[PDB]
Structures are given as structure tokens and as C-alpha cells.
Amino acid sequence: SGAIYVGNYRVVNRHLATHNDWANLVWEDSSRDLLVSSTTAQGCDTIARCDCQTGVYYCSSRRKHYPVSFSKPSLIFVEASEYYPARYQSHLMLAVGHSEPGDCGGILRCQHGVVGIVSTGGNGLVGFADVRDLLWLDEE
Ligand SMILES: COc1cccc2c1CC[C@H]2N1C[C@@H](C(N)=O)CCC1=O
Numbered sequence: 001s002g003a004i005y006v007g008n009y010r011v012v013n014r015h016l017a018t019h020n021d022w023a024n025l026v027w028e029d030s031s032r033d034l035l036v037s038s039t040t041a042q043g044c045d046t047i048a049r050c051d052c053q054t055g056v057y058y059c060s061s062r063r064k065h066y067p068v069s070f071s072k073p074s075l076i077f078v079e080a081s082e083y084y085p086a087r088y089q090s091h092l093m094l095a096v097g098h099s100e101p102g103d104c105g106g107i108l109r110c111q112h113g114v115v116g117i118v119s120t121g122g123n124g125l126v127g128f129a130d131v132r133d134l135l136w137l138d139e140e
């Protein structure tokens, strides 16, 4: 589990969104595994606006933050899970690292701020849903 709290937005994995998230929906995209809902309180996270390929992510199944090198956001084939059939997921970045299903929502960050959240895993790889192209998270 986990979310990004930027401005009056809460960014979560679409597959982990709550009824309150759907009832206060701003934007959602199944192909990216992302959903954004509105919040009453202002958040403290800042979004990175960069093309970094190195950063650090939080792994709840180890209680640890790991430094990783990750690929550029791309269209990647992801195997069937309890949340999605086998499909192409867009704006996904891969790194070598430990992940388990409940690690989804952990933040990946670089020197500029939050880059994305854990979205997929298995086989010693971890995939992150990028949020750096969502410029509207910084306003309104
Ligand atoms: C961090 O999220 C995960 C980590 C480990 C396992 C899994 C997740 C998300 C779902 C689940 N999953 C991953 C799929 C894949 N990407 O290879 C294959 C089958 C499967 O059940």
C-alpha cells in the first residue's frame, strides 16, 4: 500500500483505490495502473520534473529503501495478476529489486522529488508507474 500526497491530490495504484477515492475522483488510467483523488488537507510530497534513471524506492516487504537504476517509462508486457489480465502497461519503468504484491504504492524518488510508485513485480524485478509527465499535479 501507499500513496503520493501532492497539493490537494492523492495518487494511488488504481487497483488499490478505495470507495472514497472513487467518490472523489480526479483522474484514472487503467493502462498506467494510476488513480488520483482529491484531498481536504494539503500534502508534502513534491513531484520530480526530470529524466533521472537512478533513485531510491521503498520496499514494505523488507522495511527498507533501496537505491536502483531504472529504465525510461515505456510500454511493457506484464503477466496476469489478481488485478489485471496479461497486458501491456504504459509509462512503466523497470529495475532489479525485490517486490511482492503488497509493496505496490511504495515511492520511487530521485534528487528532484517523487518519480513514481511501485506497480508491478516478480522474478527479482520491480516496476514503477511514472508520474513525472503529469504536470497538472503541481497546480489547481
Ligand atoms: C509489486 O507488485 C508485485 C510484486 C510481485 C508480484 C506481483 C506484484 C503485482 C501483482 C503480482 N504479479 C506480478 C505479475 C508480474 N508483473 O510478473 C505476474 C503475476 C503476479 O501475481
Ligand SMILES: [Zn+2]
Pocket (backbone or CB within 6 Å): 048, 049, 050, 051, 052, 110, 111, 112, 113
Ligand atoms: Zn530526477
